[PDB]
Design a protein around this ligand. Sequence first.
Ligand code: CL
Ligand code: MG
Ligand code: MG
Ligand code: MG
Ligand code: MG
Lengths: 169, 169, 169, 169
Amino acid sequence: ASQVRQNYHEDCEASINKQINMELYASYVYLSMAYYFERDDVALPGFAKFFKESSDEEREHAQTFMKYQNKRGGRIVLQQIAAPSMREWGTGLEALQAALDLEKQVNQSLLELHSTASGNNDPHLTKLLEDEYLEEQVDSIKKIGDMITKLKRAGPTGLGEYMFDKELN
Amino acid sequence: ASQVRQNYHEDCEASINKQINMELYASYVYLSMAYYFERDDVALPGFAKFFKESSDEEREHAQTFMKYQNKRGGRIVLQQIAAPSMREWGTGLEALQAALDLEKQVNQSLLELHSTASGNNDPHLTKLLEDEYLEEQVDSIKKIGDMITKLKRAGPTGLGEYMFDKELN
Amino acid sequence: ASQVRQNYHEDCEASINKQINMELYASYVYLSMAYYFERDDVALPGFAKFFKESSDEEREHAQTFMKYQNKRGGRIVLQQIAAPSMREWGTGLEALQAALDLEKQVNQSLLELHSTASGNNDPHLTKLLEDEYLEEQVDSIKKIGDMITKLKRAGPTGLGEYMFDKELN
Amino acid sequence: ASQVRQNYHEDCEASINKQINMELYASYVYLSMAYYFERDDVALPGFAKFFKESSDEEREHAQTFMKYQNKRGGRIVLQQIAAPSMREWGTGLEALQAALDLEKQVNQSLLELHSTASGNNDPHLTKLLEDEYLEEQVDSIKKIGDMITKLKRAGPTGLGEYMFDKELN
Ligand SMILES: [Cl-]
Ligand SMILES: [Mg+2]
Ligand SMILES: [Mg+2]
Ligand SMILES: [Mg+2]
Ligand SMILES: [Mg+2]
């Protein structure tokens, strides 16, 4: 084992590798959305910027798990990053709804990782998950939920979508 | 011939003079649009400003071709600048659609001159076209396409046109 | 077709989608290398920083192609990003040798795209490739070649690798 | 009991007293190392500085536990600080290896305290341990592991030790 490894269960190590891939996948979904909103026939620059920033944040979250794996003496195993399932994301509202679903899927995986860490009596890992992942995940879900409600109020299509996008920019 | 002339084909020289006239014509079209949008019964100051700036940019493009003709030792031949095809340009959307078509007509002319320059083995001229014209032309076409999509989303008439115009201003 | 599309061949559009994927793959390879060099049993922070920066630059290159696709009215079609071919990259020298080979593979792909663009008489695309890709690619290959020579001189293992890494940091 | 005491188990109080002593001992070990590296026949000022700083940090960790004991209404019971096990610490590498082992021994003790606190349903104490101790302990172990790898690469004796020490200074 690594000279640094202590109290680090193989199941936690393996689950962190799976979570790295999930965060990279989420980053790729948001990158797809960002550039979809820059198509000449879509032209929603506020949505584009929101998803660009979201993509960067998910990549940073993946990198924090990679750093964490090394800190604990685990070994990073990277796998293929699947392309998002659709080429086009529909209306701004449909993209936000897909993002909300994805954020909750990621949250569920993080909570399952927390359960694995707790069951293996790894408080360093439960602290990481609580402070660096679960907190931001709840804030992200709340933000997207607010945005969905605001967009339903404004529009969600036509002038209201145009105005909502401008406030988002 | 001019003491400076070297590798400069008469067909390229003549086509440059045609491009100068086309750019001056485009400048005149956009000047007409700019002041149409300042009529008391139109009153779209964002559209007016957009077309004023566009008119100035096309005049600058014409001047860069005039400077180029002199750099290569060709002789500038200026001709009449045709009146724009319309006295009144309709809605903001109709003006943008006319602008998109004009920008694509200009792009086609520039690409045809690029072909003439390539066929005459004139890389100084292909460089000029690529760097000083074709690049900005694609960016302009993309910008106007985005604007058309945004205006169709906002409006394209009534309150949405009013709001889109303000964002443009 | 898109309202903006002009002189943009479907084969060029498809090849741009391939290049986006290749750039994202290169970004992933360099990300893998960066964190390999942060393992507690590797501990080469100069190499880690070099590959982190390289990863970010390749992702930016991918994003510029995504923006380009939209500018021309093509449609981004993302593909799965393959896993890097190795979990462990060996010595610093072996990683640089792998990077040199990857940079030359990317260069070959860019030159093939350039040939496709030239054969389809698309000077906007040849300009993009020359100015935004081929130039930086030659500079990157020269930099890595220099680094390989310097590391062979210093080391390439032991104290020389330790000292070379410091200079890189 | 103290007027402030609430949900504070006597076993946790006693274990905090043990940890205070362990931290003071670690501080003394690192103080011994620091001055060993300032002997005229050792003369490794980077190692000396690293261990001086480490000694101060361990004393601060002990003081935070003393403050904590008082915050909860426990009573500080100090114990003799044992002499370090060696008068002479050998090579820089041997000292780092001894430090790694000591850091892991302290980590094990902190994890045992965490288990005691968790079993006694004391989340204020688990929070202290996670945030103020376990986090820095993993970072310290990773840093020392990196240093051991770097020193093995550089040297670990002779010129490599001289150069590694300079980088540490
Ligand atoms: Cl006329
Ligand atoms: Mg263990
Ligand atoms: Mg609606
Ligand atoms: Mg065409
Ligand atoms: Mg009580």
